[model samples]
Target: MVPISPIETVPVKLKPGMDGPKVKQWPLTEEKIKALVEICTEMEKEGKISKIGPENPYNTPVFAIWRKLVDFRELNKRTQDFWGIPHPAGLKKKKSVTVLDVGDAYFSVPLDEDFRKYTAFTIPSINNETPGIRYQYNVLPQGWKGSPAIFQSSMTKILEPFAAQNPDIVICQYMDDLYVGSDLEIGQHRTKIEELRQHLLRWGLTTPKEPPFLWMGYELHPDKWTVQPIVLPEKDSWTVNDIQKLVGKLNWASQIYPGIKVRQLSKLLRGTKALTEVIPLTEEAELELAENREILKEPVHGVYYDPSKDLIAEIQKQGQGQWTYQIYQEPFKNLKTGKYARMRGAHTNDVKQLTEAVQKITTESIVIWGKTPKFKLPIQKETWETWWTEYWQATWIPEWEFVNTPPLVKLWYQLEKEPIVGAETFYVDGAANRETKLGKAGYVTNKGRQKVVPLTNTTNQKTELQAIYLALQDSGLEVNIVTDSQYALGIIQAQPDKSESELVNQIIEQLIKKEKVYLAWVPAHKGIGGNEQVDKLV
Candidate 1:
């Protein structure tokens, strides 16, 4: 019959309203209780509700083994603190942790049958005896059951005194493996180990006699076993026999040395004429190999590419098994109007290569126009004259009454003309592009014809103001100097009431003083005849 494992249990806590036994008997809310009830009802309908009973082990024992190992390590420390024994002497303090491979240890254990047959007549008095071996058929391996716990407890008890005497020393045990560390000073480590060995001897544990220790670049076993360097054997000492020995050692070492380029090394050693012919390492190979090693050491910073759907698909294809692509964030608007748009950046280490691939996939167009000679006129003299004639014919001079009318009052008026004439003006009275370059004036005008004149002086505002002045001067008849700028209008309106900047104030002073120009602000982009014409020209 199979052995049964113990059942696991969990604890429950009571809350404020749930403290009373009556609260537990109360019915739950419909929404909150429906899901669990539905599951139970389904189970009852299926006739599986009655099948619940003592269950078999749900998960594997591997997790339990790991937990036991960790628990043993922690218990080892407590045991050492409880006792006052030192660690084994002369044992090297571990620089790196070592794994106690239980699988290997189990494999090395001799079977009882093999052991009995091998030692059949060695002891005549023990004949026909089963020996009742620790590891035999129908029994678990000696090292498998509680070896980690037992070993850790024993070592902790043996080293307890040293730990208490020297608080700086540390003894960490996991299973049969032990790791010792101190301040890295050789004398202190030796003293700690000496004390530990004396205690172990007192407990009847036999320590390895000779070196029995591995230290800084040397492995010292009971009989001082040394491992010789496999590469670059001592000069003037490599005989034919020595070379053969080295080769054999290298063959064994190759199984464990990771990241070694086996194919390249094989090529170097093979010494076959045809092998050289097929697999010759060029100068480029040396550079590439060096570069690969350097790159492996350096940390990589990734690059971003386009976040289009096709680009994402291509990135997924290229980075198969190598890298992952994820939507870092969704696209969002940066402004209130939501007119301008942007997407999250797509990333990959191979962004440069991906960029080239994407560019290849996209269609490209180029447009070119032949350069004209610098001395040639922009338009022929006849063409210029024709344009000027069209301009004059398209021009319109409003009646004096219309010119005097306010923008709001003139909104109802209509001119019986084909090509409308109007002006749209702008000015920056106190504006700066970079630093504060005050009183910049600028203006855009719908020249009576289908043309636009953008005016500027030292400052665009001044230039626009000047352009308005020039337009009024140029107009020989009653003209409607229409402007859609509030700044320009404000300047003109306040001319009599305040002292302004000398340049802008002068332009405003002249406009009001002459009374030749009519300044008005038309509501912009309303499809009004004059406003539409000005918008089109500008």
Candidate 2:
């Protein structure tokens, strides 16, 4: 185990959902905005802040409508999958946060009159003053759709120079909070901490809060030099919704769950997820959580909590934020093999993460995350995940070779035209429903048999190919196979990418025997004899 322990956190989102603001507010929220609007009115008199009349009507204070920005990168938050990959065994020893907003985040944005209505929103008066007066947003107001992303981008640009100069400090923005990392190397922490203070010359630029390491329903507590998970005295439940909420909160805490094995619980909580449905948790679910109770306490590493490049800090800023399941890509060109591939997370950070994970496998620079150079990696769950989990990293040979070919080019010119051997048709068809999941392919001729299996992951494409497989077994006869699904046909003939798959693997196997097996396609509803009938109990 990586030394189980607790962690710390800070608050970056000054407000969430709708931070409905009003006048008569206390301490500078009132005085500050009041002062800001005063300057805005003055600026509007000139041609600075707004071109049109920067007027405040109805006295509605500046209200934020946008929620926090979510990083859209594909990161696998799976506790089990990521838990033991890099550290292996008991899966401890990693987790990590920082950062704050530039005081001018709001100031950096141009509050031109073009977006006046957007800046002008309503909130009930705190003083109960009858007709609420409208307020204006001169700086990054409490909330707005583009505010976070813009603020982060601006912060990045401003900090770029300073960050390079101060490599020892891992500075970042968790929303508007400004936090400093703890693992400063040896005596460097002293100077970095000191110089960090010196740089506070840009005071009002930041609000000074940091990443909320302790968030949602869990908190970290340091135990004997290690971090331990503590489910706070907050919401705890097995209800699908509650379970999901717990998972979500911990999911965001990708820093590390030290000694935590919530993987089983995380999996169980996925009960037909309706998101907010209030179904109670099952005993199995509760037991799962109990066993992996230390999950939230585990320390995590990585700086990709917020989006903007979904960046895992390329520079050697922190030793802790290594994303083990990371899939990244690099331009691969090895002339010896004449092979070129992009080098690239487990839980996919994007084409890059997928690629990286694949490369780590084959240990080859040229590995496919799933047909890369091309990998749709599916969007559906269950079968799709099963596909990636099991079928990924079969080695990309790309010549239509699930391994391709080359030529003694001039030698085969005379043999260009050959007879189509073994040309007898066998009736093979697949039956499947996209929704009420059930699957089976019918092979109704010769050595054909029956095996109606519940195929949660089966596609008419793969299954249809399976039908071809069973039919192909009868190579002794004239085997012209009938089929549906363009999926299987493309691999057998069109000479495109043959991604690894059980059916595709079998197809390749049969292709080597040099037996007589061929294919033909027919529309399901075209009524070609019994072809349209799926031959199953639908």
Candidate 3:
């Protein structure tokens, strides 16, 4: 908000209705004219500045009329007096003073005859004229650039002494209408108005017989005036129509009432359209509207504060002693196969040797029961090939042979679909750093483009999962999972087998519920289309 300082002031007074001929020729009595002359002379002697004559060839009448009202020197002196504070040119502080000029509401005053005649003559002289030409004529445009400044300065000179004495009072004058007030008590307010009114009357301005003052629901001069609120027609009972009317009124007031929310009231108002006829707004309706508007300006967020020491102590007890025991003694339950259980004695040593081999190989890369790694040992290649053929022929062929075979074979046959385009795959190559808790994940693109995207946290497996999650989240399109880590793939494929894998299980559940997500395993580093490219990128 900017500070307000008055550039000028005027004591306004309402006049009675009178025809133009009577007003123009109304004789100013010798006594009244003498009093006006005295006031003007005194003001001029007090160093009031005056206006410079207009330079435009077209402004002869305007300049003449302005000069008739007050001399140029007086106007200039008043400007300096009224705007005592040093304000830069063009950025004058706005006056908050609202001047409601009440005149004979039924009367009309003729505009200056010279202005009307000049407009009528000049408008037709313009060549290539259109309807806009007439609009320019009717606007009563002031030709002088300094007309407003001159008018303000004139008013300021008239009201300067009063304004200087009473700095708090806001004096507003528009032509003959004047209003004066301050944050003063009612008696002081009335006194100020009376003083201004007397001064204007002394200067040959006429005050109407009736008091023109209205403030705070009371007439300042009760014997001379009355006031009333602006109200719309009332209706019967609370109904939709009543709401609509009230809503319209509120909407009109919205400029003055910032942060007003009318959505709820608007909905109620809209409901009124269905009603048969008009209705009255209830007390409840009015209260509701006011409450909604008030709350609309409130801040919506703050810290939660619940400080109860006893409640905290009670909650702490649940975690103490044996009260927080685990629900289960072990994390897993193994279900051994019948074939594996029967050959235990003779195959125990063989199983141990195979387990050691599997562990060693898994430590270097990832290992699955039947799936082969991209880089293989010479001896393990035969074993891997045999396992792959047997696993597919025995377990998968009978049920999915017709449905899945062709598409799988077609993928192998079709060059375009063989290697997925834009595939940049990576994997963590080092152990997780405990301090940073970050795993070193890296990738290579299908075009042999290599870059490492760090996914440092938990195990490399977890980092890999996060990397995939981030990629999918950023894609802005549907994504299909393609990975060679069987353990990681299995974590995604199988439902949660134990409570220990709750995090992975939650992710799988979310994926299943979510639309447009699919998971598939591509063989690691094999010389096959998609798998080979994925391996090379990794």
Candidate 4:
């Protein structure tokens, strides 16, 4: 169930009589967080600060995220035509190839606080009024994990509308990189560029536009650049930090050339032994490391990538949710980061009221909003074993933290000993908060077996949708699901698409399997026991 007040997306608008830049407040202090942590460590060493014996009764959890880039050759193995060898494509029917590499792609995004959204989500998107998400749960570009998807998805969405309206342009984007070819005319390139810039301009990138509707990073380059498996010379002594830096650079080098080879150089990344238990610079690995450095000046092949004909807009939702005014002004700026989120749009001096809007987050919200999770020790055995097992099941012997294990496997073996057939009632609700940077979903079966699901990166809409789906899977019997998400209801009740969440996909998969399933909206905290219970769990 959702609250009486909802927060959601809206198109960029300026309220009359409201002035001053709303965007002046938002900022992400990466340097600041690091500095503070260092100071605390120093203080601890000096004994200036003492660890409390369970004292403050409050906590601040720190977390970090690093995304490893991989060679496309390895990536493209799934696709037949992908190769490290240079392709004759990227040209206009051999008329000529115009290569346009974007300048400072991700950082160029105009929104100053675009990265702030990822710092910590205080509430679920169900009714969150924030930049980047005007209407629906937008996967905007950010500097964190899953950013590639966010950037590419937003890139594609930005292009989709423009492409639909302009028949003379061919807009192709691979992450922040882009390859454009006009399917219509020979000299339409400049015209196409202008049209694209117009679109970006409309999106409010007018002042200091980034990804400035142009490509400036590419100049004359060699035909192809390829790195060999880097070897750090059978190092007699190496530490975990060394390997992390070593492997990190190598991994990124491979990915730099998007469509490069997936051969030995790519395979060298395999057998990533340990970060805690560092491995030696292996015999062959060190030599390859030398070879890889040779090509460090440039890449051999990631150059030519045609627009993915396969990629279409994964989403189709327009801004369609009720939004409530939120003000984080006062001590609005987070002290931890010493940054104030200068609002993006005009608003009156309204605050102090929302302080009481203490909301609880659940997994459902995280899944829907696609938020980042705070770092917390699992501190649970069952969850621990399941994590490594899933890791083993998925890929190379990996870091064993309940890292994500997709595929609706048995989350917890809580099956009913005796099946309850026929009809059933499912009560669902979701909670989220900025401090927690997480959202959780709660659902109770008529039989009183309740499940509370916490999600690191998501929205309540996802929570509602996924909860309904899981309940539907567990209960082949007819189930009446009550949730307060019109956004989710639309997806569940419609002809869904692959871009939708996996749970939504499950709902699609199970539509035929189930005999009957019904969804209805119920108000939150309304005397309804089931809804109240879900709220309590949230």
Candidate 5:
């Protein structure tokens, strides 16, 4: 049943000057090892694959899914992405359907002899007695990036004559799964199906004589649609790898039911830095899992997308440090409001993408910020103008730059309830531009004697100490020096040695000479009067 494909043999191409990947095999359990051995033996006996020597440059790890042996990812990265298939979401559902699942679909197509060396995979030694065995597929293998698209297009080419002869039946092909949709009873088309089956069989493809109502993950019925329910054994904790498997299952189901709201399962992603790390199951995640289980158990009627319906998109800043948006089709009567669904964020970029998606749906769509919804109370023009001004100021701090800047460390430095008779307090400030390596330092005394000096090639910490040194030199004996940089204060508190910066050493020398140089730290961006004046000057 191994009829070579009529199309040209598939060749593996690499990027310019790129060598093939050589990844080590992952460790497997005893059960997995036995399954892998049996599958390899069968494939060898069937002439689907052959053993290779270490001369082949390409080698990927082997992984097992029960009795199936698949290559690990790596070779797929160097391959080019080519061709497209009919999108699953764009297909129409018919009242009567028969699915054609091609058995050993990809293996039916042969790989070019010149490119077979690039498809090598290593099998780790099962025991101490045997060394690792190397093998390469003569046919296209699963887990390779370009296999699905190539297989889909080749199958389409092979069935062109059959489709033209039977124009009444619509055969929707997505890789190996074919949904044959017909208006009449499926049994009436037995003769036509038999003809198509004979044609496919000539190309070394086989399908059931009487196919069931199962198509893509979803079980199609004449009246309703249903999915296989997920069942997790009752447990206290799960490893990251275990949770990943559940996410994959739910992710596929989401495609079947667009409006399914299983709560934000973002909590399940916690403590997943390492695959082996275990996360304690939270009550919220448990409730979400239970809800999805119940959802899958129930059958859902037809879901229709009507363009006439108005869309309402609500954006909210989540406490989990993500911006979330939910787009709803209005009227709120049915359970179809959560169509676009809740999404996580890369912050502003995600918000912008969501806005674009909303715009594509309808120009009349309403976008609401936060949880208020529909702007119940009218906002004044002045309030909007003030908000716009504040927003403009915020953008001055680049998101990337602000993220890398050190945060202001909290320190207890309170002002005296009563002021000293002869002592004068001054607010010193400094600002620096990392790119220019230039800075400005200034101090504003309580008596209104303000001084601003520009310095060349200095850091914020050095500039801050310079500001304090300048203030001490020009002030009276008993003076209070209030600055907003804790980094500068930390150096002074530790008593700088020769290894410290020259500016920091000079500031310490000035402090020792003064009768009472009371150094105080204050929080920045707070509307302290003297501090604000000095900050503006810098």
Candidate 6:
């Protein structure tokens, strides 16, 4: 018979509106049903689970794995999460150890009676069995979201005194397994093993201690070990459930690897919104999974923490004339090759005490004093160029006013358009509102009236090109085409052969046909004479 903890009963707390549709059990073979029924009968006799009516508001789905009934999915989304400290990275170096494997660990902790109805799950009606009768847990169930943390907290509370008494020896509780450093190797504490076993027995939790163990899937010894093999899928595409299974396997491997990133699987994990949606596996992700498999295949040796080794203290200069430092030991050295393995500690800011902290490690260690080279900040080239060019352009301003003046310079000097001496000048402008999809292109000649063309499927630059095409098509005279758009003019001049725009092609064709056409650029709407008049038409 499995013993139950006399410790306090834990209630399953959930977030509001977690109500889910009653899910039906998957069809099982006759052998599977018989196995599930036997387990359920035993659980009922032990008072670990109680049969309840279908009138309960909540229900989670259940399936049998050989002899055990495992409930899963949906109810976890609404469970109020309880956080607890996970197992430490490594345990202290002991000669030999004993592990107490608590039988039905989570089931040992009692469940609050009133909240058991919320943890309800259904089994299908077997041949002569009644329908609509579900079972709720009388103890904490195996697969509920918060059960592990809750059990760890309860177990910690039960063993607090034993921990306090045996300060020299290391004791690590990883969920159900309690690993204690034994006296078989370290001769000082042979009695501590029997002490802890009797302490647990007093609390109504019974388990016999065993040696040479496995914790969190890694087998333990005085030396080296490898992990359990991770199963990979054979298909090209996978559903959310498939990825979930892979993630669960990788999580245990990550404790050993410590570098398997959650972000790498972000696209695949996001598909959890629709669990049945099939996603084609990416090449990068397949390579990542393959890399993890290779890493797991490699054997990882145990690390011994030597208290006598010379610790390293690293120092860096910080802002405000202060120095920051750290006192950390060298990483674990591999026993086979004598090479230091990769590792992934504390803060201090004092020069005098920093030297003293190094002294604390050992007197035999040497301190290598060093100095950093001084560097000068560079002057940026862009700022220097801007200043020199602005002065250079200022020197040309006076010469432009007096030399090479326009033939018909107007009374209001800024108001007149610059013109080529022998050609009829025309100002073209185009306007477009991207949101409304409205466009207009127009041209006004010095002597003739304005012409405006409404257009569709046009952008601002495309419209400007269209206006030039229309104006050149209208005139037979030798002409000067003045446009406000530099982009359109550049497109027409530097005509790339494989242009995607037909409007640009048409404008270039017009320029080629009319050999006497002179194209000039003018700044828009700054009181240029013909350009100002053409802007009103558009």
All candidates: CA RMSD in angstroms? 31.2, 16.4, 29.5, 27.9, 14.7, 18.4
| Candidate order, TM-score descending | 5, 6, 2, 4, 3, 1
Q: Candidate 4 versus the native: TM-score?
A: 0.25
lDDT winner among the candidates?
5
lDDT of each: 0.32, 0.40, 0.34, 0.39, 0.59, 0.58
lDDT of 4 by residue, 420-479 (tens): 356687777765554554777767878776777777776656666766766666664566
lDDT for 95 (candidate 2): 28
Deviation in angstroms for 98 in model 2? 10
lDDT (Cα) of model 5: 0.59
lDDT of 5 by residue, 92-113 (tens): 4454666678898888777777
- State every prediction's TM-score relative to the real structure: 0.21, 0.37, 0.24, 0.25, 0.45, 0.45
| Residue 536 miss distance in model 3 (angstroms) | 23
What is the C-alpha lDDT profile of model 3 across 7-108, one tens digit per residue? 323322112342111001123344444454454344335323112222212211101121223222322222222222111110112222234343321011
Model 2 Cα lDDT, one tens digit per residue, 1-538: 4332211111123223333222332222344444454555564564333422334431233322122121211111110110001111111212222333345445444433333433443333334454433434444443444456556655555556667887655664455555555455546655665566445434324343322335333332221121234344344434566666666554433333322223444555543756554455567556645644544434443221111221111101011112222222222211111111222111111223323433443342132212222222212234233333433254221111010111100110011123345354566777667776567765664344333334666666656777777766755534566766666665655321223365665665565553445567777667776363556435
Off by more than 4 A, model 3: 1-157, 173-176, 182-192, 208-245, 252-261, 264-538
Each model's backbone clash number: 14, 70, 15, 60, 0, 0
Tens digits of per-residue lDDT, candidate 6, 438-463, equal: 78888888778578888777678777
Ten-residue stretch with the least lDDT total in model 4: 311-320
Higher-scoring candidate on lDDT, 2 or 3: 2
- Give the Å error, residue 204, model 3: 3.4
Estimate, for each residue in 204-241, the C-alpha lDDT of model 1 and write its tens digit. Answer: 34343224444333343432223323343443332444
| 2 or 5, greater by lDDT | 5
